[PDB]
Ligand SMILES: Nc1ncnc2c1ncn2[C@@H]1O[C@H](COP(=O)(O)OP(=O)(O)OP(=O)(O)O)[C@@H](O)[C@H]1O
Ligand SMILES: Nc1ncnc2c1ncn2[C@@H]1O[C@H](COP(=O)(O)OP(=O)(O)OP(=O)(O)O)[C@@H](O)[C@H]1O
């Protein structure tokens with residue numbers, strides 16, 4: 001943590017509901033999906049889980 | 052939410068073909084004329100207005116969609132101004148030397164606006180240059196599906212055939228089942 | 240071949256390489272005449288042919304174990320049954336150190352050469368092969384410490400005349416103890432910049448190995464390598480690492496660390512009487528060091544490092560911002576020269592942060608606002624202190 | 632066809648370098664570069680094969696049925712274990728997981744491909760000792776219709792250097808021939824320990840065995856429909872290189888009930 | 889006829905002893921190359937008149953004639969232990985598209 005050494009301290013906070021929706025969408029483009037799946041509703045149900 | 056965007060609008064060509072048939076009812080033809088004139092006014096189908104007025108309709112009726120030069124110039128000037136703005140964005144990204152994802156996205160923006168007005172050749176050039184990057188296979192699938200949709204828009208089936216065989220050739224380099232179902236619907 | 244003076248064109252220069260060619264051709268003529276006079280049937284280059292045919296092919300590789308009754312030896316190849324190989328005349332009987340890599344003949348297996356190691360699979364990383372960068376100019380202030388380190392480590396090597404005339408052996412070792420982030424490592428980089436000696440760096444963590452045996456083994460190897468490549472400026476850094484930490488990967492625990500420290504405290508002084516091996520250690524916590532290491536006669540001149548003062552702070556600001564694309568709006572006088580406590584590391588850290596921020600905006604010039612923002616950024620990212628409350 | 636006399640040395644083909652040369656590893660221990668006989672069906676020179684070699688020349692002269700060199704044999708009927716799914720009480724979730732990760736992928740890969748999921752190619756039944764880790768697999772072998780090559784961990788290691796990776800490759804080749812098949816390397820914690828001593832011959836051979844196992848498992852393409860199962864009592868004493876996608880991913884967690 | 893002559897001559901060539909796979913750990917000189925032959929030890933081999941010593945690079949697999957170890961060929965695979973470490977680790981590939989949020 002001393003300055004001069006390792007420089008940038010970057011935060012990865014646990015994903016928010018929008019971030020969770022984006023991650024679910026990204027990983028959901030790998031399987032046959034029925035039309036009109038409300039992924040935003042599923043992510044909104046998914047609380048605490050991350051990545 | 053993600054969307055490939057309703058560009059080009061399929062209903063434009065749908066009602067254009069509905070108009071160009073004497074077999075269909077006159078009332079439905081006039082409804083199609085009203086819709087197509089409204090969409091030409093709103094979404095700036097100036098090049099498609101010129102094409103529809105000079106070919107298609109009068110190629111084979113045709114009073115409702117009358118080739119007005121003034122309306123062909125005002126909307127064309129607006130379209131050229133928008134194209135100039137997009138060129139400014141592309142050149143400013145090149146000057147800033149941003150990430151190649153961003154320059155590829157700017158190329159997609161130029162091409163999708165070119166499709167948004169109906170010019171097939173320049174849109175094809177923009178998306179062909181856009182493919183030259185090393186973007187992810189999903190973006191390439193979406194782009195060449197956009198040229199396939201353009202081919203559907205102008206009712207040139209061989210254009211769609213070559214676009215979709217190009218899709219199938221490289222679809223094995225992807226695998227995303229949603230992007231394969233899109234191609235399945237297009238091929239069907 | 241010698242060096243050539245002067246650099247530019249000059250007739251005397253041409254005369255110099257004319258002498259070079261004259262002497263070279265004269266050596267060539269002498270060698271030609273001497274060879275021609277010699278009986279070629281046992282001279283000239285037929286010796287090469289005889290050596291090749293006696294050597295045989297392929298030459299296997301083994302390990303020497305003894306030199307009993309010279310013209311005889313006991314090699315030990317990894318697979319062969321440890322033959323009683325005889326030593327031939329071609330090999331040099333001075334490089335046959337027990338444990339070398341000899342070249343056995345294929346069939347009769349008689350030593351026909353010693354294969355020097357020349358590997359250095361681990362030392363190559365250690366051996367300083369390119370001067371880092373900073374010269375002594377880059378260090379702002381610290382004049383007394385620079386003078387002491389010079390007269391302790393540089394002058395004995397470059398200019399031994401003063402010491403031999405004065406009649407004092409040079410001070411053996413120097414330990415750079417002080418507050419963290421105050422140039423204890425920069426000064427080592429500087430002394431490594433101008434050097435006529437090998438500079439084998441090592442960090443105290445690497446002496447805390449995992450196996451029981453390879454605690455003193457590493458130190459013995461390091462100091463042997465320093466000895467053979469004399470002179471050496473070995474730079475054991477973070478020497479306090481052996482004391483604290485207490486790593487789980489260490490199988491021995493405290494006892495193995497104690498044995499390693501004992502081997503270090505021996506190899507520094509030794510019964511072996513090593514030659515020109517200068518030792519420069521540097522640590523943040525001089526307190527947690529067994530006084531056997533820091534005893535005089537092992538490391539004599541214990542140089543103290545202290546946080547810079549206001550003038551030293553402004554000098555550091557000047558040297559570090561010398562290579563700045565600075566706009567005139569930035570004023571160095573009130574920049575960081577504020578007397579509200581800094582360090583030798585903060586001044587460079589805020590410069591780096593401000594440069595990064597200016598890069599983010601793509602502004603090729605540096606703004607005073609960016610410098611101030613990096614200043615406060617460095618200020619918040621700072622564990623302030625603990626002992627000041629006693630005297631506050 | 633005279634070099635094909637009947638003293639011969641079994642070798643393992645490794646890499647086809649040219650049309651008439653190859654790199655074989657004779658059972659004696661050391662690799663060679665040899666000339667292939669111009670009569671063999673060169674389409675059969677698959678890697679890790681069981682080709683034969685001439686005695687003093689090592690020239691490749693005959694390819695063997697790849698199910699011949701195997702020291703480990705497919706479990707037939709004399710060794711068919713006598714437990715049933717009904718006999719294994721409880722472990723309902725474990726039973727379902729092993730059925731959906733072992734039996735169903737063997738039977739119906741087309742469903743896995745169509746759905747879009749990645750078919751598992753390795754399971755790591757683990758838990759406290761005495762939980763049915765061995766018995767669930769034992770019951771699987773009593774109902775499976777696929778080959779059930781059963782190796783026993785420490786059986787891989789032998790005094791003869793090179794009898795390791797060789798027999799690992801041989802076992803995997805046998806599994807690939809009789810596809811579908813299930814390998815049941817048992818007590819793998821004796822082969823895939825974390826800590827490693829790069830000075831003694833004991834660890835430097837288990838290392839080669841583990842490397843060969845890892846390379847062969849990575850060589851699993853989407854086809855060949857062969858699943859690998861291993862059980863252990865101590866999951867912590869396991870090389871993390873065995874816990875990556877493409878390798879063992881599904882992890883069953885047999886709990887002390 | 890060329891095919892027939894080759895087939896007839898093949899019988900003699902098979903009885904010629906094979907060649908060990910070599911490993912060029914270090915280049916010694918212009919006519920001697922240190923080679924570690926698996927799995928026993930290393931040797932100082934002689935390069936043939938075809939292969940150039942400067943062409944050889946460390947970790948290049950090679951072939952040595954079994955009668956008397958003599959360089960006669962250069963392989964292609966090499967060793968490169970780095971792609972062994974990243975193969976054992978098996979880090980999955982990714983792009984900026986995969987990461988979201
Ligand atoms: N007087 C100075 N002149 C120039 N630069 C300095 C000075 N003092 C400190 N620095 C800068 O501080 C930076 C970080 O400090 P440095 O690494 O030298 O400290 P250290 O106390 O030896 O390190 P550590 O506490 O991490 O073992 C160096 O890169 C150097 O450029
Ligand atoms: N679900 C179960 N129902 C009945 N008996 C069981 C069950 N699970 C284990 N057992 C008992 O376990 C014994 C067999 O050992 P088991 O297969 O359970 O060992 P394990 O947990 O795989 O051991 P290890 O880790 O040492 O290989 C039998 O005596 C059997 O009665």
Ligand SMILES: [Mg+2]
Pocket residue numbers: 420423424425
């Ligand atoms: Mg330091």
Ligand SMILES: [Mg+2]
Pocket residue numbers: 761763764765766
């Ligand atoms: Mg058991």
